[PDB]
Write a protein that binds this ligand. Structure first.
Ligand SMILES: O[C@H]1[C@H](O)[C@@H](O)[C@H](O)[C@@H](O)[C@H]1O
Ligand SMILES: [Fe+3]
Ligand SMILES: [Fe+3]
Ligand SMILES: [O-]
Length: 258
């Protein structure tokens, strides 16, 4: 499945989980939201950004030791074959992990990729490596953040929660700034696709609004393709490019701000 008890990749993902749960604090996320929130680093098309990820392997992913750009196409393809009628959703597959361009810009990987969690409240039991990787996090020594709800009001809504910083929130905010013309569902899925304690573990319902609950099956449906299309046998990217460019032209055309 996705194996955190066995695997030939488990040490590197154990390091990045340990480093991520150590340094992802309320302060850190507040800093990074500003650092990236103006989308002033680069100008690029989707396929340019996709190609940039020809240069990136994920250290938090125990299912995968090849360029992450191949996984973009694999996820897109899996979705396209299961949901022929929803082209916007094919594209969400191609797009979802494009926020990882941040690791090519010198961000450490624990600050880019990986299962997300809410920062500013106590980590819940389904956070990977929760029992063993949070003891050097300064926020857990802070009474403002060490309780179940921490800085949050019950059922505030995930859109009102400060998530540990990485690819999902970067891309969510990117797509708003660039005004992608995808459905609300698309933005939501990308923004919370890493939030495994929530969509897979049964955790963080204290923070959920009814709207979040309603979105859960969409993110669970996205997640099964994100996860299970991961395979060493790679797509014919050159073959597929025209199809995806056609969707890019419809939903998020031209040079974009990153
Ligand atoms: O190792 C994976 C990879 O980093 C994904 O892009 C991320 O969304 C997943 O949550 C993580 O588990
Ligand atoms: Fe991801
Ligand atoms: Fe992914
Ligand atoms: O992902």
């Amino acid at each position: 499945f996705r194996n955190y008890t066995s695997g030939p990749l488990l040490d590197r993902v154990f390091t990045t989980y340990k480093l991520m749960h150590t340094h992802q604090t309320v302060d850190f996320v507040s800093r990074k939201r500003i650092q990236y929130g103006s989308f002033s680093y680069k100008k690029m098309t989707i396929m340019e950004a996709v190609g940039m990820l020809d240069d990136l392997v994920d250290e938090s992913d125990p299912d995968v030791d090849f360029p992450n750009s191949f996984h973009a196409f694999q996820t897109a393809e899996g979705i396209r074959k299961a949901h022929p009628d929803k082209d916007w959703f094919h594209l969400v597959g191609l797009l979802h992990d494009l926020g990882k361009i941040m690791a090519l810009w010198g961000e450490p990987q624990w600050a880019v990729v990986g299962d997300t969690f809410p920062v500013g409240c106590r980590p819940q039991a389904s956070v990977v490596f929760c029992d063993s990787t949070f003891q050097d996090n300064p926020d857990l020594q802070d009474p403002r953040y060490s309780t179940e709800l921490g800085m949050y009001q019950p059922h505030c809504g995930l859109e009102n929660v400060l998530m540990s910083w990485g690819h999902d929130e970067y891309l969510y905010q990117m797509m708003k700034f660039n005004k992608f013309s995808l459905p609300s569902e698309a933005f939501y899925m990308i923004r919370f696709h890493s939030f495994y304690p929530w969509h897979t573990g049964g955790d963080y319902r204290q923070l959920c609004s009814q709207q979040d609950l309603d979105m859960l099956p969409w993110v669970q449906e996205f997640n099964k393709f994100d996860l299970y299309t991961k395979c060493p046998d790679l797509p014919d990217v050159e073959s597929l490019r025209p199809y995806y460019q056609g969707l890019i032209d419809k939903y998020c055309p031209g040079t974009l701000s990153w």
